[PDB]
């Protein structure tokens, strides 16, 4: 068995589906069943949190965390992960086939793990956590930063890393929970963490800040103030008032078992409070969705781009995308209906997939759309909705599910079948279940329809 | 990765773990967390049931049904099959770790499955279904029974059988919904159907028949009377009053690949009404459980023993483990507070795991004690709650969430960790699920706890 997806998807992954620039009606089909590939707790009170996912040309790579006890625990975690590919059933549509399974159950609490599709099996970005995040952000020293390869041959690489830029700049710095990206032999990972403002790194970036505004819905108040405010927002007190730091882990492919990777740091200029991430590669065009952990309640996307060097200087470029659609939940002074500068650690990861390019050769595409999973309410985890949405606003929205029902983390991956143009979207979404407890993890595949 | 079970485990399966013949107490602890190795469905309304599971010596292997549909109808189902070992983690216990999985997805209604743990992979006995049950006990020629056999080379065979003695006797026949076994090169699933009256067969048992009595909780009434509607009870109209008969398919494995195998047909003058059941081999001994879907609503469980010949005359002996501590639930005349004969297809799929043996060379052990998953109510199914228990009585209860939920099948496998003595039971029952609708199929994992 090899570890190849079905041919009729194998071009039809990581493109832009929508590339006419013009605008599309949508309708979001009805969940279509298959066994899940994602593995629920045992238990009524087991804790089952983060998930990661990418799926590649050939597979598809998962991982996410499992805790004996209440999602509020502290001895230790384990990481289940797993491999496989896209195998077309009789009904009609394909189903998710594991083909390896690994779960990392050895008393090392690796935590907030990102994965990443790489020739023949996955990589997985983690941190030991020994502390609560606030001791991270609070202390002066990293945490244990480990890469691990899982490949088709059965073979497990764990490494201890500590990527150029780290030592002396940062209290604290973990993975993005969301997928890398390999790419022109770099293995990329999103992450985020606390930079010490006396350090090098913070003594550069020390006036960076980056706000966007929404034409209809702004802010009260003077340029400079707002700017001020915008400014103080990257230094939340309840991170013991450290730089919170958006980063990427650089890894040279061809020495990812010797490398100790790169971090490279953006300029806050271009991007709002480090948070958790993604990074994705559509038609060779690298995006990174930043989860809106600041007071920013909207959708953030970024075309990004890298210079690579040899002697560790590489660096890093972001554009936003203007998106001002839907607003994430949140809670005080940064729930979805706050849209003004303020010191906010708060929000949900909901990551969006791309259907159309945003800027392209001959321009920049004002029609674009994006599909994912919302949760349906300003100030709490609930209510997860399916949905399309253009840039100011949404196109169709589908809820999974009854009112009420609590929900989390979401991804979301859209890929086509090129026999018969079908274009798929999986939306895997933290739900909450009577029966297994916080969050069974469940990926929705469902059919995207796409007219005039 | 070989497919061989966690050393520690090996010897400490199929055996019996209380062989002192003394009383004991008991303890069952909370579930233990760790990933299913059971998919659950991914939408809200699709079916997923009917679970069979085995674990051998070296792995286990498990099946269960999934319908893109409402579990009414579709008339089109898919087959879900996995293999795997277990594996010791560092939170203290074993888990289920997958390494083979086949989706059996080609339009072929694959229905009533049963799975059996054999060399090197697994086999399943189906028969394929194209009309209702009904019609097939009210028709004259049985549907088509499937053998398929899945190795860890991802080897797949499947063939269409004709066991001796089905044609010309049998209306239908389909497989039991319980693990078979391999045993003395001899493959062997419980299986059920419908035996034309005026057959060879049919002429020969026209008389047997099989009354248990509660001695604590008698029916009232002559005997010669509760014999007759005993003896009618096997013919109920539901099903076209043909004879409703359990029997045994055995094929010869060292010719699995061309042989029609056998139907060996217990006498029912030591057996109930045909029903679902379970084949075991526990210390040499083969068991068989029998669901009672007729009006008998105790527990039945039989010591079996085959003699098998080489013309196709083999037989099966049969010996009733007296059984009156819980009952089942059913619906009318035929629920769980019924002891009388009457014509009922009723009740539900509960089987148990025996701790102790009941029949050794010395005598017999009145200190039986056996362990599973019943349903808390005399009617409905509803009220999932692991039990301990002995011949008479209940030795301990635990419930499986809140009162009111509603669960269906449950399999129960115990077997014991030769490194620190460890007891463990796993419960795999259909739980109704309020994210993915009708049965996730959980296998709760928990320590068993022997005193004195
Ligand atoms: C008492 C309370 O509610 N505390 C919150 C805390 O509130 C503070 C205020 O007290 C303070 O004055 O002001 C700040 C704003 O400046 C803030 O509002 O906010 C914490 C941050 O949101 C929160 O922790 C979060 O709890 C939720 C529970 O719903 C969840 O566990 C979050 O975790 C995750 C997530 O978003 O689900 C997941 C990962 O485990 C986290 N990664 C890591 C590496 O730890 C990830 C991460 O935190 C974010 O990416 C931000 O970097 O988020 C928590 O972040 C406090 O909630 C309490 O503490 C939690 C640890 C948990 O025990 C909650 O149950 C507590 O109520
Ligand atoms: C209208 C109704 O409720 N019909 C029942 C039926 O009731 C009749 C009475 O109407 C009649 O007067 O008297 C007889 C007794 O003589 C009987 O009570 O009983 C049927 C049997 O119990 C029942 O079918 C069962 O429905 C349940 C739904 O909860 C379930 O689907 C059962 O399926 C399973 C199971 O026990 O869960 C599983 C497998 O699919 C079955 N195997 C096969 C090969 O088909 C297995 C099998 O039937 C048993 O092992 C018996 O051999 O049982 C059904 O058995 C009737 O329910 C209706 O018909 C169902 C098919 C379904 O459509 C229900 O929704 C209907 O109400
Ligand atoms: C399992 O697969 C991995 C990845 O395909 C193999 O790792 C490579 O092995 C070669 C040895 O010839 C090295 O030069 C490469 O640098 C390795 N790549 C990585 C990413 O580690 C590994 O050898 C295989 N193991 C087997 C076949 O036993
Ligand atoms: C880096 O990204 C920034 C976006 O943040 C680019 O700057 C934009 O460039 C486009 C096209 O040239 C202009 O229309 C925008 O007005 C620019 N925005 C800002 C804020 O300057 C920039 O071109 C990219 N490349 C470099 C080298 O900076
Ligand atoms: C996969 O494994 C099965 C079972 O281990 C192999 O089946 C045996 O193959 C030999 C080779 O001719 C036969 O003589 C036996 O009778 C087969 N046994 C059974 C039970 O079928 C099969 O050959 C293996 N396939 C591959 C490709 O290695
Ligand atoms: C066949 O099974 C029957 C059980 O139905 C066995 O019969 C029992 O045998 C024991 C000991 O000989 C007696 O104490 C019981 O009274 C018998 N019960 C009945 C119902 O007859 C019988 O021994 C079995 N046959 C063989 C060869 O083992
Ligand atoms: C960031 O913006 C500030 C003005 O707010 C400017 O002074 C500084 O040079 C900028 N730095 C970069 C790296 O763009
Ligand atoms: C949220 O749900 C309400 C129904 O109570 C609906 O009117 C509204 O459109 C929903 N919003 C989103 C963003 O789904
Ligand atoms: C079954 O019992 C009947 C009496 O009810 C008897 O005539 C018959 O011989 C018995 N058959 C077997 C196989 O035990
Ligand atoms: C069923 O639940 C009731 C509580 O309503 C309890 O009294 C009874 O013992 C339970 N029976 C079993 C067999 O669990």
Same mark, same amino acid.
């Given at each position: 068995?090899?570890?190849?997806?079905?041919?009729?998807?194998?071009?039809?992954?990581?493109?832009?589906?929508?590339?006419?620039?013009?605008?599309?009606?949508?309708?979001?089909?009805?969940?279509?069943?298959?066994?899940?590939?994602?593995?629920?707790?045992?238990?009524?009170?087991?804790? #089952?949190?983060?998930?990661?996912?990418?799926?590649?040309?050939?597979?598809?790579?998962?991982?996410?965390?499992?805790?004996?006890?209440?999602?509020?625990?502290?001895?230790?975690?384990?990481?289940?992960?797993?491999?496989?590919?896209?195998?077309?059933?009789?009904?009609?549509? &394909?189903?998710?086939?594991?083909?390896?399974?690994?779960?990392?159950?050895?008393?090392?609490?690796?935590?907030?793990?990102?994965?990443?599709?790489?020739?023949?099996?996955?990589?997985?970005?983690?941190?030991?956590?020994?502390?609560?995040?606030?001791?991270?952000?609070?202390?002066?020293?990293?945490?244990?930063?480990?890469?691990?390869?899982?490949?088709?041959?059965?073979?497990?690489?764990?490494?201890?890393?500590?990527?150029?830029?780290?030592?002396?700049?940062?209290?604290?710095?973990?993975?993005?929970?969301?997928?890398?990206?390999?790419?022109?032999?770099?293995?990329?990972?999103?992450?985020?963490?606390?930079?010490? &403002?006396?350090?090098?790194?913070?003594?550069?970036?020390?006036?960076?800040?980056?706000?966007?505004?929404?034409?209809?819905?702004?802010?009260?108040?003077?340029?400079?103030? *707002?700017?001020?405010?915008?400014?103080?927002?990257?230094?939340?007190?309840?991170?013991?008032?450290?730089?919170?730091?958006?980063?990427?882990?650089?890894?040279?492919?061809?020495?990812?078992?010797?490398?100790?990777?790169?971090?490279?740091?953006?300029?806050?200029?271009? #991007?709002?409070?480090?948070?958790?991430?993604?990074? *994705?590669?559509?038609?060779?065009?690298?995006? $990174?969705?930043?989860?809106?952990?600041?007071?920013?309640?909207?959708?953030?996307?970024?075309?990004?781009?890298?210079?690579?060097?040899?002697?560790?200087?590489?660096?890093?470029?972001?554009?936003?995308?203007?998106?001002?659609?839907? #607003?994430?939940?949140?809670?005080?002074?940064?729930?979805?209906?706050?849209?003004?500068?303020?010191?906010?650690?708060?929000?949900?990861?909901?990551?969006?997939?791309?259907?159309? &390019?945003?800027?392209?050769?001959?321009?920049?595409?004002?029609?674009?759309?994006?599909?994912?999973? +919302?949760?349906?309410?300003?100030?709490?985890?609930?209510?997860?909705?399916?949905?399309?949405?253009?840039?100011?606003?949404?196109?169709? *929205?589908?809820?999974?599910?009854?009112?009420?029902?609590?929900?989390?983390?979401?991804?979301?991956?859209?890929?086509?079948?090129?026999?018969?143009?079908?274009?798929?979207?999986? $939306?895997?979404?933290? +739900?909450?279940?009577?029966?297994?407890?916080?969050?069974?993890?469940?990926?929705?595949?469902?059919?995207?329809?796409? #007219?005039?």
């Amino acid at each position: 068995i090899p570890l190849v997806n079905d041919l009729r998807f194998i071009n039809g992954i990581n493109k832009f589906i929508i590339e006419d620039y013009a605008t599309h009606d949508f309708s979001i089909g009805h969940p279509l069943n298959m066994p899940s590939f994602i593995p629920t707790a045992t238990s009524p009170n087991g804790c #089952t949190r983060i998930p990661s996912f990418s799926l590649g040309k050939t597979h598809w790579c998962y991982t996410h965390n499992v805790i004996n006890a209440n999602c509020k625990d502290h001895t230790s975690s384990n990481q289940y992960i797993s491999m496989g590919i896209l195998v077309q059933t009789a009904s009609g549509y &394909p189903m998710f086939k594991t083909l390896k399974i690994q779960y990392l159950s050895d008393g090392l609490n690796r935590k907030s793990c990102s994965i990443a599709t790489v020739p023949d099996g996955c990589a997985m970005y983690c941190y030991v956590s020994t502390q609560l995040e606030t001791d991270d952000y609070a202390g002066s020293s990293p945490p244990t930063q480990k890469l691990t390869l899982l490949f088709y041959n059965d073979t497990v690489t764990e490494r201890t890393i500590s990527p150029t830029g780290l030592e002396g700049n940062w209290a604290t710095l973990v993975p993005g929970v969301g997928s890398g990206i390999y790419f022109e032999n770099k293995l990329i990972f999103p992450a985020y963490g606390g930079v010490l &403002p006396n350090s090098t790194l913070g003594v550069k970036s020390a006036r960076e800040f980056f706000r966007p505004v929404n034409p209809y819905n702004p802010c009260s108040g003077p340029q400079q103030d *707002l700017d001020q405010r915008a400014l103080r927002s990257y230094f939340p007190s309840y991170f013991s008032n450290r730089r919170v730091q958006s980063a990427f882990l650089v890894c040279a492919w061809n020495q990812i078992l010797v490398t100790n990777c790169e971090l490279v740091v953006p300029s806050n200029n271009q #991007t709002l409070m480090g948070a958790e991430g993604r990074v *994705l590669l559509i038609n060779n065009r690298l995006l $990174y969705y930043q989860r809106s952990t600041s007071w920013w309640p909207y959708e953030l996307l970024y075309e990004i781009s890298f210079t690579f060097t040899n002697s560790g200087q590489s660096s890093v470029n972001m554009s936003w995308i203007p998106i001002y659609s839907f #607003t994430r939940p949140g809670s005080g002074n940064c729930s979805g209906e706050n849209v003004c500068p303020t010191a906010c650690v708060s929000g949900v990861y909901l990551d969006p997939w791309p259907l159309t &390019p945003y800027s392209h050769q001959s321009g920049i595409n004002r029609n674009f759309y994006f599909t994912g999973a +919302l949760l349906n309410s300003s100030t709490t985890r609930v209510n997860p909705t399916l949905y399309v949405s253009a840039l100011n606003n949404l196109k169709v *929205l589908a809820p999974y599910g009854n009112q009420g029902l609590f929900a989390s983390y979401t991804t979301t991956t859209c890929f086509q079948d090129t026999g018969d143009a079908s274009v798929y979207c999986v $939306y895997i979404m933290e +739900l909450a279940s009577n029966i297994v407890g916080e969050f069974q993890i469940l990926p929705v595949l469902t059919r995207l329809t796409i #007219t005039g």
